[PDB]
Nucleic acid binder design. Structure first.
Lengths: 117, 53, 89, 203, 61, 195
RNA sequence: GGCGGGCCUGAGGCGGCGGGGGCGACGGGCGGAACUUAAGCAUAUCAGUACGCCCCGGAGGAGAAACCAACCGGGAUUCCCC
């Protein structure tokens, strides 16, 4: 099974050579008093933090930012961890356009592993 | 394996040894019988791997 | 219990999700409930409650409403809503 | 501003006007067959909450289910065996009469795939439910995108399998959240997940 | 018979309601399966969004 | 004769029996208004006024498809389809028009499939003040709009040339139809001896 | 009473198209045991299992909160580790 998934996962990679397989998700405070200090990968950046970066909800998904309208911002500090997260991604992203320019796309470093760990 | 066949014990007083038997009276369902299930069947549920730290 | 004890609970500012633009029945929902009530009329369980109020006062009227509607909060509202019809005839 | 008013008239079914039209209708369905084809959805509004639309390829059929506590069937009404399982006169059906009405109309009409069911009339002796069914073969249904997924073979005879509405309530899916953890995929499936014994080889 | 099959095909050709033997064999499931295009078909309201926010190739270092 | 004792098929018998049960039962007033509609001469004089407006014919719909729609590449405008004051039908539209008050005469039909569909229209008419009439057959009201059957047809702003006739029509309805008197009827159950 | 039209609930025939049955697994819904265990047996237990029944797929079922949580909180389902 490990190999089966590994082969399947690399097939996904070549179906989309430009984009990394796993999208960037936000750091969310782990729940319950015992896990208060650590942060974890979360379902989606909330609509509020996304509008702080300045991107519409649809545009973010296209760029690979997952937007979950279920999560509520709650703490103001939660807005801080996620808005900067989105910022560090929007700078580290290069969006190919003009139909398709072949030589540039061929030299693409796909980010294997979850984005911005 | 071995449990596929059908045998209801002939039982005591018929002079047959007491062992499950087929319609004719042939040995079945016993480790000592020909064609019977090995009493303790081998197992695929074994600790094939012995882990090391 | 169900709360941990940090005398100084609160190290991050909290925004309160609230109201969600708290709305109302609005003009149409109430108007329609008037349109149908005008033609169809009051249900029999309601009629008994109103008739209890002209003579008896509450008590047994709430008791019939708890049995018919199944919860006191719905019943307290029903007894009160029904009373408006009671003080006219 | 139209179907809203009918829904309100359907919020009072004890009122004089809504009893009279109910007497006429329940009397008539008693002098009619158990699975009878109805050209018009008797209640037009309720149909559109369930999904019915008046494009051809949609048929409304009315089932009559008798109302009673289940009586287990055994020779001479005795379940031979341990005392806990003796019982043939007060058992209660585990599938609601709405779901049974949906399975019923499916056995006499297999080609059509039923959607959900709307209650029409009821008496003491017999209840009546009307189930909207959609014919997968009629062209308009396949081409229209919204109802196209029913035509997929996976959704064939959903009624019997338990993909109907009163069926999802029957397995308790209609109850989500804690208090329903043990039925999330299915009760028989859940039993296997917890009871599964797996030996990790490299542990 | 080979000559007979082709001659009938010409007569019942490019026509609706062909005779069954001529119709492509397939498996039972394929004969009754939806056409691929109709499966792709989406409600028009749902379709507008796909064009409005289309896929974009992006990479993160 | 032998005609009276003829055993009709079950469908004929059940449909006949429903009428007998209905005429002998209580008949609450809200349903009683539908049972007794406006007089035939009055129906003729509103029906005659419907014919003068009304939407296009089915052949006219085909004529629009072949020329108005197919050759629009040669042209350009979309609504050269008739734009003349027209009766509308259908409960969703009629109720929005009646609630709007823009409508003048509502012509609801005496027979319905579920009576629930137009039970709450007569009250709506007297709450927004709209004059209303119950007339014979949803089908012979459907003919006015050319659809197979219409629960209700709403007279509209109306052409000014027809406005003097329209005012006479409205007045006659204003005596024959009264919302409150009809709510005090409670129907009837005439027995076999009366027949 | 007669006759002809419209609507509505039905009656036959035609045309096209579906539907039925099979598979020792997996899968979904029911109906449903007892031997056993409790050193006896009734509640328990075996077991929401055997078996009976109906239905589908290449996976099905499940699924985008009338949801957990009580925290410096999470966020559809599905699976796996604990």
């Amino acid at each position: 099974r490990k190999i089966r998934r590994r082969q399947t996962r690399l097939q996904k990679a070549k179906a989309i050579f430009p984009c990394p397989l796993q999208k960037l998700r936000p750091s969310v405070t782990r729940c319950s008093q015992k896990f208060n200090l650590t942060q974890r990968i979360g379902r989606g950046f909330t609509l509020r933090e996304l509008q702080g970066v300045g991107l519409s909800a649809g545009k973010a998904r296209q760029i690979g930012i997952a937007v979950d309208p279920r999560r509520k911002n709650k703490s103001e500090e939660s807005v801080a961890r996620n808005v900067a997260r989105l910022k560090e991604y929007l700078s580290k992203v290069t969006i190919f356009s003009k139909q398709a320019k072949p030589e540039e796309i061929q030299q693409a470093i796909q980010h294997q592993g979850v984005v911005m760990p | 394996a071995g449990v596929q066949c059908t045998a209801h014990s002939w039982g005591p007083g018929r002079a047959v040894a007491r062992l499950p038997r087929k319609h004719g009276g042939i040995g079945a369902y016993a480790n000592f019988a020909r064609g019977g299930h090995m009493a303790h069947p081998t197992t695929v549920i074994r600790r094939w791997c012995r882990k090391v730290n | 219990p169900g709360k941990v004890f940090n005398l100084k609970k609160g190290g991050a500012v909290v925004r309160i999700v609230r109201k969600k633009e708290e709305r109302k029945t609005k003009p149409h929902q109430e108007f329609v409930k008037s349109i149908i009530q005008e033609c169809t009329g009051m249900a029999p369980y309601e009629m008994h409650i109103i008739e209890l109020l002209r003579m008896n006062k509450d008590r047994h009227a709430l008791r019939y409403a708890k049995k018919r509607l199944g919860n006191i909060k719905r019943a307290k509202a029903k007894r009160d809503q029904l009373s408006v019809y009671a003080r006219n005839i | 501003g139209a179907y809203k008013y009918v829904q309100e008239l359907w919020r009072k079914k004890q009122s004089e006007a809504l009893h009279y039209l109910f007497r006429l209708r329940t009397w008539e369905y008693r002098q009619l067959n158990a699975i009878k084809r109805c050209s018009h959805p008797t209640r037009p509004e309720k149909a559109r909450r369930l999904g019915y639309k008046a494009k051809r390829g949609y048929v409304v059929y009315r089932v009559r289910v008798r109302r009673g506590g289940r009586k287990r069937q055994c020779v001479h009404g005795i379940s031979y065996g341990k005392p806990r399982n003796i019982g043939i006169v007060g058992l209660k059906p585990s599938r609601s009469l709405r779901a049974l009405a949906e399975q019923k109309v499916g056995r006499r009409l297999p080609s059509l795939r039923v959607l959900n069911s709307y209650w029409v009339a009821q008496d003491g002796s017999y209840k009546w439910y009307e189930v909207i069914l959609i014919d997968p073969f009629h062209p308009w249904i396949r081409n229209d995108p919204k109802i196209n997924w029913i035509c997929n073979p996976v959704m064939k005879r959903r009624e019997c399998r338990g993909l109907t509405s009163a069926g999802r309530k029957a397995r308790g899916l209609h109850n989500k959240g804690i208090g329903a953890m043990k039925l999330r995929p299915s009760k028989r499936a859940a039993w296997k997940r917890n009871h599964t014994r797996s030996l990790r080889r490299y542990r | 018979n080979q000559k007979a099959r082709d001659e009938a095909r010409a007569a019942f050709e490019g026509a609706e309601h062909i005779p069954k033997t001529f119709r492509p064999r397939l498996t039972h499931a394929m004969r009754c399966q939806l056409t691929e295009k109709q499966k792709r078909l989406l409600p028009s309201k749902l379709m507008k969004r796909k064009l409005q926010f289309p896929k974009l190739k992006y990479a993160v270092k | 004769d032998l005609t009276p004792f003829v055993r009709w098929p079950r469908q004929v018998r059940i449909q006949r029996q429903k009428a007998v049960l209905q005429r002998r039962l209580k008949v609450p007033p809200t349903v009683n208004q539908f049972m007794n509609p406006i007089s035939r001469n009055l129906t003729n004089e509103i029906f005659n006024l419907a014919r003068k407006y009304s939407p296009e014919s089915k052949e006219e719909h085909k004529a629009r498809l072949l020329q108005i729609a197919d050759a629009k590449a040669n042209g350009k405008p979309l609504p050269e389809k008739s734009d003349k004051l027209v009766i509308a039908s259908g409960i969703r539209r009629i109720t929005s028009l009646v609630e709007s008050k823009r409508a003048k005469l509502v012509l609801i039909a005496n027979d319905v499939d579920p009576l629930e569909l137009v039970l709450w229209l007569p009250t709506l008419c007297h709450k927004m003040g709209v004059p209303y009439a119950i007339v014979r057959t949803k089908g012979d009201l459907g003919k006015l709009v050319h659809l197979k059957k219409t629960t209700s047809v709403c007279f509209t702003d109306v052409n000014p040339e027809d406005k003097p006739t329209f005012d006479k029509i409205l007045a006659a309805v204003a005596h024959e139809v009264d919302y409150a008197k009809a709510m005090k009827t409670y129907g009837g159950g005439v027995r076999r001896e009366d027949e």
